[model samples]
Target: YINPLDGTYPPGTEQNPANPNPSLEESHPLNTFMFQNNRFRNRQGALTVYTGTVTQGTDPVKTYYQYTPVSSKAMYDAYWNGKFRDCAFHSGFNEDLFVCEYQGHHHHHH
Candidate 1:
């Protein structure tokens, strides 16, 4: 979801709603990935975090959506706890986007 205010203004003026806002499907997929364990290991490892903003179709600097990092477990828990975390990705960072990270613990053996 593009914010009402994002792109360039008229030299101190506020954002112009006239600007075209793109959907998440139009932007590139900016995602946060987590590794529970080693790739070679049986279990997953640490988590990877990331963030993104949605830009306007006409204005490159215009950002709409601002995503923050939350515990993957919390996210998953939300899903398992009666919340559905539907995963989707945009074509780029210039549209509606859903960015999240993976949080969990894993054990490795030598």
Candidate 2:
């Protein structure tokens, strides 16, 4: 697994899944863009590379157990499609810290 502290993002950039901003380009820290090239960009118009994802660490929890990013485009679409939110920092989870959840699936049947 990649080191959590290696990636960089602007302060107050509002990591996805927390105060998730669609404009932000989120990806797994190990993604080619982030790991190989370090291209984590945020919605603040800054070009600095950003790092985040659905399944973070070596030991994933049930919440992130099913997360599997097949390609960069797939992950990109996830962000564009509003499948993530509550962006935050966590080493034992998604490397990028973007929580994967449906945007319009908050229904509670009684």
- lDDT for 107 in candidate 2 is 70
Task: Provide the lDDT at 104 for model 2.
Answer: 33
lDDT of 1 by residue, 1-110 (tens): 84323322322123322212222323333342223321100002212222445576674566543332223344334345432233222223343233333333323532
Model 1 clash number: 15
lDDT of 1: 0.30
Residue-by-residue lDDT tens digits, candidate 2, 1-110? 74334333323345422223323223333321232223333232222334333444455432222222222333344345544222212223434433322333447742
TM-score of each: 0.20, 0.19
lDDT: which candidate is best? 2
Best by TM-score: 1
Candidate 1 to native Cα RMSD, angstroms: 16.7
